[PDB]
Design a binder for this molecule. Sequence first.
Ligand SMILES: c1cc2c(cc1[C@H]1CCCN1)OCCO2
Ligand SMILES: c1cc2c(cc1[C@H]1CCCN1)OCCO2
Length: 330
Amino acid sequence: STGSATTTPIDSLDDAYITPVQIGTPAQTLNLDFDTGSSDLWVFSSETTASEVDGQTIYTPSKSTTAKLLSGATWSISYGDGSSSSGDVYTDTVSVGGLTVTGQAVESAKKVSSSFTEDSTIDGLLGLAFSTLNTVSPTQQKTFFDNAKASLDSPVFTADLGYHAPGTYNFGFIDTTAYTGSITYTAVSTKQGFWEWTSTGYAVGSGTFKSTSIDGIADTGTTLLYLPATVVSAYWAQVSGAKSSSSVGGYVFPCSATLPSFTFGVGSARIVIPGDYIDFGPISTGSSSCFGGIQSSAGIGINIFGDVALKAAFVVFNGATTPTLGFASK
Ligand SMILES: c1cc2c(cc1[C@H]1CCCN1)OCCO2
Ligand SMILES: c1cc2c(cc1[C@H]1CCCN1)OCCO2
């Protein structure tokens, strides 16, 4: 089997991407944030504290003939941006782009933190990291990908995120028309539950490539590119007037700037992030100070190849017995 679904930026800055997902019988379609940095499929629901719902579409298990309470199971998750959610669990039929899993754990939110409430466009998350990170207790549950894997034509999914445009998540096949050149594959460590790999280095604009190992994760659920302070300083030093602002919470730059590109290494291959991808716009409405899309990972404890990096590439998440990651230009 295979599946193919379009993923769409939630706003004009590509702050996140949402993908329609069918849950239950008859189908209830929710727009979920596909997140290769976590492993819980959770949704706003009829059980979510009413004051914490503001415009989201909710899953109502009582209206699904295939929903079953997973008795005794609870979940609770805290993310690296300080947000969180928790609740109980149902199993139900879940379909993405024509690919169906029966008996998928659908984690129903009873509580969500303020940033979830405040984002009306995201109805929940669909985790695509390794199932070892799943938070359901006392019986850990499998991700949608893990459940689908054996049925897929090939045990893979691909992320093809757009810049200011829709893109695609495919399950079970590699669309050879969706990228240029060849796909370069690189080793993955699953020891922390993430799609963790080692970049071979970087360049800033038209500068020389610096060969250096940068361990990090491929995370579709993080918006920005978080790298070591040395690398980030070298980037922003090429932008007149750029500086790190403790009050704003990262590097800012004059909105009048033209940003240089940023290249990262994948083995002997190179992925180029255009300068425009690194512009996240005014820090507040009407400000001439703009927020940067490359930020320091110092304090976070891990480097993160988030959407800013991934959207410059066609990315293969290879879930074979020994997982790997593939990157191609596009
Ligand atoms: C977003 C942004 C982050 C982050 C974690 C996240 C979570 C929120 C839900 C999906 N991803 O960790 C620190 C870097 O920024
Ligand atoms: C834009 C502008 C900002 C900002 C964050 C953003 C984007 C980056 C990813 C999600 N929101 O924080 C600091 C103020 O300006």
